[PDB]
Structures are given as C-alpha cells and as structure tokens.
C-alpha cells in the first residue's frame, strides 16, 4: 500500500521541501515523474558549493510555487520558459537530489567522505546496459501531478546551471491514473498488467523507515549521510507484444500472484503473506516466481527490505522495432548492499527475465533534507 | 480557441465512434495523444478488408468502453492486457484511421482510387528527416483523457493483428495541463511558451468545416473520399535550451505575437487579426515572422485554410546531448495541396527555422466515418 498515491487534480497542493528529510521518498507517488541525470561541470569544491546553493534556491521556489519571474527587459532571455502561463503552481511537485559514485572522485576531494556502500552500478546477468543511460554525478527525481510542471522544473534548473550541469540521460514516467486518483487505496498497475508495490513497508511508519530507508548514526557511515538514503534506479524494458501473447496461467506463474487481485496464488487478499514452507516444490507459487525469490522469508534477511517507488514509461519503438515501454524502477534503502544488491542477486535467473531487459539507471545517494532557508544541499558534506 | 479542450478527469465521457465523419478531427483536444504508424502485412485485398473490418470492431469497443473481456481459459493469452484493471473506461477515446500513399500501390489494386493530392512526404528546405520516423501504410491517431487509455487501446489493436500490422514508428504527445482544465477557454501552450491554436478555423462551424476540412462532392476526387480529410503530420524537434537562452524580444519577433497574451504584436487581444497593409516594412510584425508568413490574409489566402490539432511531446535526449522535446504537428484539410503544402511553402525560411527541426511524419488521408455498426472502414474504397 505504500508509499501511497497523490491526486493529479491538486494544482495548488504543496509538499514540504524543507525538512529533516527530502520529499519524494516517503511522499505518496505523484502521477508524473522525470528521472534526469547530470554530469557536474563544477571546477572545484567551491563551484560544487555554488551549484548546491543554487539548486536549493530553485527547488524551494518551484516546489512551493509563486508568480512566474517576470522579465522587465526584453533584450534579456525570458526568466521563465512560460510553459505554465503566468503563475507557477506547485502542483504537488517534489524534487529529490542524489549523488553518484563519480562525484567523490579527485575533482572535489570528497573521496574520504563517500558513503560506504555507494558504487558504480555494474551489470547483472540479465542486463543489457546502455552506457548512454547509465550513472551521472547527480540525479534529480522530479515528481508532480502533471508532466507540464515536471518539465517546467527541469527547464528552470537548466536555465540556471548552463556552466554547472549537462544533461546526461532523462526518462519520464507515470502511474496508472486510477490508482493515482484513488489516493493510496489502490496499488499502481504496471504495463505488464500486474500490481506494482503491494509488499512495500508502511511508509507512514516513521520508526520502520528509520530501520528500512533512512541512514541512522548507528551505521558504519560518514556523519553527513545521516537522514539520507541509498537510491537504486533501474531502467527496465518490457517485451510487451510477446507478453500479451503469453498464457494468463504463465503470466501468473511468473509473478506468483493473481493478476486481477494481486494476491499471491492460492491466497485470497492482495496483501496476504504466504508460507513457503507448505509449498516446497513451488506447486502453488513457483520457486521461479518473482514474489518467492524476492524473499525466502528466512527472518535474517527480512532485514533486507526496501521501499519501492517505480513508474510506468512509454516512449517510442526499440532498435528492433518493438514497442519501447516498461518500468522506471526506483527504490530507497538505509543500506545499498543490504537492500537492492541483495535482492537483485537473489532474483537472478527468475522466470520474469525472459520478458524484461534492464538497460540503464545506476546507484546514487540521496542527500539529507534541507532543514530551512539557511540550510542547503550538502551543507553537512561540504563542511566536516 | 478551436477545436477546444476536454478535461482529463472524466473517465466516463464518450465520443461517438460512428457517423458521417471520424472523431479525433473536429473533436476538442483530449489531454493525451499517440501517433502510431504501421506497415500493412495483409498480402491481398481480401486481407486488407479483413483488417479494416477488424479495426472497426476493436475501435467501436474501445471508444465506447466496457468490462474487460474475461479470459475463461487461462492457458490462452489474456484477452485483455489488464493495464486498465477490470473496466475499459471510454475516457474520451477517439481513434482516427488514415492511410498512406503506399497503401495505394500494386498490392491491393487500389491505385485508381487514390486521393488526387495524396503523395509521399518529401522534404522542405529546413527538414532533417529520419527514415525511421517517416511514412507508413496506415496511421492511427489515438487520443484520450489519459495516457493509460491510449496505450491500452494500442496494445488491444496490436494483440488482434499480429498477421496484419507491424508498428513502424510511434510518438506520444500531450497538451498543456492548465488548458486541459479550461476546456477551450484557454489555447494550449506549446513547449516554446507560446500559444498553439489561436487562429484555428471554427470547428463547431458546420459550413466552414465543409469548405476547409472535409472532402465534398464538388471537388474532383474519387467518391469514396467524401467526408474524409487530408492529414499532414510533422514530427518537429525544438532547440529548447538555445531558445530558453534567446532574448524575449527575439522570441516575440520570431512568432509575431506577445508571449504572455498571445496577441499579434501592436494589438491587445489574442484573437485580433492584424492588417499587414498598415505596416509594409514589417516594423510591428516581422516579415519573416511565423504569423505573417503563414497567414498574409490576402485574396488567394482564403483557400489555404487548414485545421491544426497539434500536441507537445517530450522524450529523452538526442544523440548529440539535447533535450528531445517538440511538437507532434497534425492538421486536417479538404485538399493537401491547397492546405499544408501551400502553407509550409509560405513558411520556408521563416526565422523560427533556427529553433525547430522537422524529423518525421507524413501525408495520409483520413477515411470517411463508419456510418453505423453495419458499416466498416474502407467499405466504399474496397467496393467496386
Ligand atoms: C524486472 C521487472 C520488474 C517488475 C515488472 C517489477 C514489478 C513488481 N515487483 C513486485 C514485487 C517485488 N519486487 C521486488 C524486487 C525487484 N523487482 C525488480 C524488478 C521488477 N519489478 C527489481 C529491480 C527489484 C529489486 C531488486 C521485491 C522485493 C518485491 C516485493 C515483494 C515481496 O515479496 O516482498 C511486484 C508484485 C507486487 C508486489 O509488490 O509484491 C511487481 C508487479
Ligand atoms: C515549426 C514549429 C512550429 C511551431 C513552434 C508552431 C507553433 C505555432 N503555430 C502558430 C500558428 C500557425 N502555424 C501555422 C502553420 C504551421 N506551423 C507549423 C509548425 C509550428 N507551429 C507547421 C509545420 C505549419 C504548417 C505550415 C499556421 C497556419 C498558423 C496559424 C497562423 C497564425 O495566425 O499564427 C502559432 C501562433 C498562435 C496560433 O496558434 O495561431 C504558434 C505559437
């Protein structure tokens, strides 16, 4: 049921930017999203500092809204792109900034300060990673009720960083409109026609999130990272035509769930947790299945939970002529190897692989929240 | 302005599939669009008819809505993709079938029935056309309140035609959210921050549309074309970053209109018609400006009429590193030569070319309407 969904009709609804934590992690999913990675063009630590301050300014403004910055002298470029009209509605916009492995190289001398488990994403067996769609110094996750707002945000940012950022890759996604407008009641349905994110940790549970998502002082981590979160992002293609030609029974054996209800097979309700003990040969829920491999339920690596916050995407055609569509997968963890790396390892060889093809994304660390208007992104990181 | 807009929240809204004309032409603009071109895999006229009859039935079902076709034998593929859940809501869906020049080749014996002005699109001076994004035997223009309904319909059509259609190219589009909710009280804003649609002819105006948009009996066309319409589709990239860093005065000089109000420069209202004769030097509205070149409004310029129904698009990043965003331009006209072909010939060398780049699209003839449940696409074209 977590993190929930937020209604696309709330043009004046605001999400808090300032906080202990960044919005857009625990925040219920907005209808539209953009994942955009950048290469940082900062000369030195001081320039990186200038960028993060500037990002703070822009994010505070856009996420809360206000009248479009007008342009008193027409010899100058417009201060706003104008694609939203004369007023910049906040439209439930959240902007979540996160940093890549590559940012702690020799450029800004932040190597000693790198998060412990942060690393460059390397391939898993079913992957066909496209280098054009991988990594980046920073990633921005931009969510709002509407695609218009999201894009307006991207362009405000670009207009403000021409010598600080260069767009690396970018993908836009959505969640199924029904589940978006039902407001947390209903799970988003993916483009394979199955419900996505049923088994998520209660995101309203501020105490479980401290265990699952947030970095806490107890972990073998650099002090600045506290209140942040390891972010794993995977760009996943679906073989859609082929899928729709595949028996429903087979579709259900692959996921291990009923397609209409989202309940594990042989159980009644969507959120029913199975006992795999009773099904040693996986006659009901295959040992193959997506749900089953995703957790042996051994208790010791139930400690391996993660919050998932994915989005459908639909683009054009693939290089081979098939429909280019699937999943923008995003999950947040207190620990990257304990989270995503453990689970995907666990999932290698799953029957779903015949139908999905990971092609991009990477690992990033989502910074601590900006506490208020005198704080900024990486204020903790750049000090120390 | 015309043709108006429809709000994206209305899942139980219906557009009439059947009638004298196809919907998705005069219909006010829904918030989401897909243009998808197919190659035809039918080998003879018999199979073409089989396809045309089959698209009639699929389109009638999708556009009116209904419970998803249940799959009683799950050893078969699901009869529905399930990405909409149990109910296929109408969601203002319209699906408009058009046929390309190539359909009228030696395959189907249709060469003598070809629309007088139908031709393969060939480049204009500023084009950078991509083979992969051009032409097609048939084009579908699939519009609805939501992206979900549009994709669902595509996948339904694909599932049912594996021996008859192969996807050629596909782009998804959208119109600006604020204007989505105004229901026509606002013209859509394009991704350059300017209003797109202002001077469109009155789409509710019955008699005007008979002159401007529909093929009628007085024009020298094959009978089967009556009530159909010529359709030009241009896939157009915007150089968005360069634009956003261009002076407002020059942005406004290039269009010939005030960005904030949309009014022709030197006038106060959006729909004001400028009289160019009072400004022969073009000191108020530039001579190479989009409004002036397109629309001199002279003697021979009352026949160049077309109806524009364009959508914004945003994908990822071009090979060269720029945001891939632009316009899915579609227009309708009673005669392609007198409409689009004349108008673009006038636009050649306009100042806006620096900022836009046609890369795909095509010319197609949108069929006459399916009269009722006993009629089918192409009945009159396939008859004698
Ligand atoms: C390959 C394409 C993928 C699809 C179509 C997908 C979607 C799903 N993921 C699900 C559950 C899940 N998938 C999971 C691991 C992952 N799955 C991933 C990739 C995909 N994830 C990635 C990447 C994962 C992380 C490593 C986990 C951990 C669950 C939670 C279910 C459980 O048993 O706790 C479910 C079923 C509903 C639910 O939440 O139980 C769907 C439909
Ligand atoms: C090149 C990229 C294009 C952009 C940025 C564009 C956008 C616009 N097109 C406009 C009008 C128009 N554009 C028009 C022909 C075309 N326009 C085309 C492509 C574009 N059209 C193509 C291709 C055309 C076919 C020849 C016409 C005919 C009008 C209506 C004349 C007018 O008053 O602007 C207007 C002015 C307000 C309005 O909607 O009347 C904008 C902002």
Curated annotation (Swiss-Prot), chains A, B:
Q: Write the Enzyme Commission number(s) for this entry.
A: 4.98.1.1, 1.11.1.-
- Cofactor: bound how, per the entry note? Binds 1 heme b (iron(II)-protoporphyrin IX) group non-covalently per subunit.
Q: Which reaction does it catalyse?
A: heme b + 2 H(+) = protoporphyrin IX + Fe(2+)
Q: Which residues cross the membrane?
A: none
Similarity-based family:
Belongs to the DyP-type peroxidase family. EfeB subfamily.
Main location class = periplasm
Coiled-coil spans are none
- What does the entry list as the binding residues for heme b? 197-199, 290, 295-297, 308
Q: What induces it?
A: Repressed by Fur in the presence of iron. Repressed at high pH by the two-component regulatory system CpxA/CpxR.
From the UniProt record, report the name of the gene that encodes this protein.
Answer: efeB
Q: Does the keyword Signal apply?
A: yes
* Top-level taxon in the UniProt lineage: Bacteria
Q: List the disulfide bonds.
A: none
What is this protein's record name? Deferrochelatase
Subunit composition? Homodimer. Part of a ferrous iron transporter composed of EfeU, EfeO and EfeB. However, this EfeUOB tripartite iron transporter is defective in E.coli strain K12 due to a frameshift mutation in EfeU.
Protein's GO biological process: DNA damage response; iron import into cell
- Annotated protoporphyrin IX binding lies at 197-199, 257
> PANTHER family given for it?
DEFERROCHELATASE, DEFERROCHELATASE/PEROXIDASE
Q: Which cofactor does it need?
A: heme b
């Amino acid at each position: 049921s977590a993190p929930g969904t937020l209604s696309p009709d709330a043009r004046n609804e605001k999400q808090p930017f300032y906080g202990e934590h960044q919005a857009g992690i625990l925040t219920p999913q907005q209808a539209a999203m953009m994942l955009v990675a950048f290469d940082v063009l900062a000369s030195d630590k001081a320039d990186l500092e200038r960028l993060f301050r500037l990002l703070t300014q822009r994010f505070a403004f856009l996420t809360q809204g206000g009248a479009a910055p007008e342009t008193p002298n027409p010899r100058l470029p417009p201060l706003d792109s104008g694609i939203l009209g004369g007023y910049i509605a906040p439209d439930n916009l959240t902007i979540t900034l996160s940093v890549g492995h590559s940012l702690f190289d020799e450029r800004f001398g932040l190597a000693p300060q790198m998060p412990k488990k942060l690393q460059k994403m390397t391939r898993f067996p079913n992957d066909s990673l496209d280098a054009a769609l991988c990594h980046g110094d920073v990633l921005l996750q931009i969510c709002a009720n509407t695609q218009d707002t999201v894009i307006h945000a991207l362009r405000d940012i670009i207009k403000h960083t021409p010598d600080l950022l260069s767009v690396r890759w970018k993908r836009e996604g959505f969640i199924s409109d029904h589940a978006a407008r039902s407001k947390g009641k209903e799970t988003p349905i993916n483009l394979l026609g199955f419900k996505d994110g049923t088994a998520n940790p209660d995101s309203q549970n501020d105490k479980l999130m401290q265990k699952v998502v947030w970095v806490t002082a107890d972990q073998q981590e650099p002090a600045w990272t506290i209140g942040g979160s390891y972010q794993a992002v995977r760009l996943i293609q679906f073989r859609v035509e082929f899928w729709d030609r595949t028996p429903l029974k087979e579709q259900q054996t692959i996921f291990g769930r009923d397609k209409q209800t989202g309940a594990p097979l042989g159980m009644q309700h969507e959120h029913d947790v199975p006992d795999y003990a009773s099904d040693p040969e996986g006659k009901v829920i295959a040992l193959d299945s997506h749900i089953r491999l995703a957790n042996p339920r051994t208790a010791e690596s139930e400690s391996s939970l993660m919050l998932r916050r994915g989005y459908s995407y639909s683009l054009g055609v693939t290089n081979s002529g098939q429909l280019d569509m699937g999943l923008l997968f995003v999950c947040y963890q207190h620990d990257l190897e304990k989270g995503f790396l453990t689970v995907q390892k666990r999932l290698n060889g799953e029957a779903l692989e015949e139908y999905v093809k990971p092609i991009g994304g990477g690992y990033f660390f989502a910074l601590p929240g900006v506490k208020d208007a005198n704080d900024y992104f990486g204020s903790a990181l750049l000090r120390v």
